[PDB]
């Protein structure tokens, strides 16, 4: 996250860190039930040196605050048994950039570990709405990850604006959230983590998945996120959640 602050301990108890074996933190995820996470499909692609699509290769840390303190009290460590990448995920565009991850055994709910609410299919997060992006990614473009989870406040951008800002790249599964003036943004390493939206009774719903962006924090380059309401039934279909 560029232009953010340290989260308080336990402030985003749905925020999960995914480590790939021997490589540390690679992507974010969100807790959504005792056995399921939402993340970005793009984190789970093989390359020639590492089968990022293979669930045995991963470790999920729930209730994590500090990457140097993964064994702190309240931190839960879990394996994955299954990665379901959206069948319509597009390599080149990042269309349908969403995955469901099944924990190998269930998360244990606590004040550090708690699921995020999922928005109904017809819910619309409106242009202008403040929401929060969290993660341990780069705190600058071309810059270094955070040890301590970062939070930054950003705003939903009008879809037409978003499409015009990033021509031939924005699909209706995508949503620009951030500032035309830059400053606050997600960045490399935040991928797969939740947008958190404070709703009408103060409960937090997931407004997106961190997906891609051009650099980070740049003027006229807001970060791009996979929408959630559109995938509500797909999630129900695949997880029971």
């Amino acid at each position: 996250v560029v232009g953010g602050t340290d989260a308080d301990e336990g402030e985003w108890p749905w925020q999960v860190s995914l480590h790939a074996l021997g490589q540390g933190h690679i992507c974010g995820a969100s807790l959504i039930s005792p056995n399921w996470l939402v993340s970005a499909a793009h984190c789970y692609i093989d390359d020639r040196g590492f089968r990022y699509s293979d669930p045995t290769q991963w470790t999920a840390f729930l209730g994590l605050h500090d990457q140097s303190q993964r064994s702190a009290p309240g931190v839960q460590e879990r394996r994955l048994k299954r990665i379901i990448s959206h069948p319509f995920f597009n390599d080149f565009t990042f269309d349908y950039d969403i995955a469901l991850l099944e924990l190998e055994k269930p998360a244990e709910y606590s004040s550090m570990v708690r699921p995020i609410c999922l928005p109904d299919a017809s819910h619309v997060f409106p242009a202008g709405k403040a929401i929060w992006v969290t993660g341990w990614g780069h705190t600058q473009y071309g810059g270094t990850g955070a040890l301590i989870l970062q939070k930054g406040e950003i705003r939903v951008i009008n879809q037409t604006t978003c499409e015009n800002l990033l021509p031939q790249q924005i699909t209706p599964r995508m949503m620009c959230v951030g500032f035309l003036s830059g400053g606050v943004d997600s960045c490399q390493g935040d991928s797969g983590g939740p947008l958190s939206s404070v709703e009408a009774d103060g409960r937090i719903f997931q407004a997106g998945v961190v997906s891609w962006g051009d650099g980070c924090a740049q003027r006229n380059k807001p970060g791009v996120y996979t929408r959630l309401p559109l995938f509500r039934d797909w999630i129900k279909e695949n997880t029971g959640v």
Binding site: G10, I116, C117, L118
Partner: peptide, 4 residues
């Protein structure tokens, strides 16, 4: 879901 969604609180602390």
């Amino acid at each position: 879901c969604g609180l602390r």
